[PDB]
């Protein structure tokens with residue numbers, strides 16, 4: 001399965017404000033989270049934004065105890081069958097919301113060293129996979145790097161502001177094969193120039209996974225200096241113990 005990462009919504013975009021007001025959902029008084037699905041919890045130190053898709057209608061769900069989750073309905077339904085929600089098999093949202101409506105919102109992401117994070121559009125999110133929410137780590141995810149490059153090179157065109165997208169990458173994982181920002185290395189080496197180059201991106205993804213997990217060393221956090229292979233379960237358990245993440249299966 002995946003690790004779900006609880007990314008706190010701190011201020012909603014203007015186009016969303018009316019909607020949240022109507023449903024008496026105040027993001028400063030209730031705990032409203034975008035829940036991103038990841039397989040690399042050890043890289044959370046390097047989140048530079050959170051991605052949603054313009055093509056997806058998300059639900060805002062009651063997750064109990066004053067928490068609310070923003071995910072696909074598919075994902076929340078699965079969560080209800082493994083004790084992560086207030087009632088087994090119950091998955092009606094309070095309301096639905098299209099990804100475009102959330103663009104520009106402000107967020108706080110667990111363990112991120114960068115501050116002032118925003119919600120940004122990713123056109124290539126697979127609707128049927130995970131939660132439909134993907135957190136952005138350009139140092140080590142080739143998809144994230146390439147999408148970040150396109151947004152930063154033409155922000156006005158994509159309907160975003162340039163200050164929303166961060167291009168100064170702080171290194172998180174050291175490898176001998178690809179240096180300290182393996183996604184940058186691989187995107188250049190394989191000459192990947194578009195987010196829709198799917199077959200090449202999958203090749204880059206797997207090369208990055210292998211080298212990083214088995215041969216990489218942490219450059220940051222409590223486990224700085226440890227091998228990623230040893231540090232990764234510890235980071236995951238730390239996040240879970242602190243209420244910042246959970247596991248779920250599909």
Ligand SMILES: Nc1ncnc2c1ncn2[C@@H]1O[C@H](COP(=O)(O)O)[C@H]2O[B@-]3(OCc4cc(F)ccc43)O[C@H]21
Pocket residue numbers: 037038039040043124125126127128129130131132133134135136137139140141
């Ligand atoms: N609906 C969706 N559409 C597109 N991409 C999605 C997605 N849900 C999650 N992801 C992305 O794919 C990784 C798992 O891929 P596989 O399952 O192995 O193919 C996840 O972990 B990862 O999170 C942070 C991260 C950092 C990193 F250095 C590398 C990867 C990721 O990005 C997520």
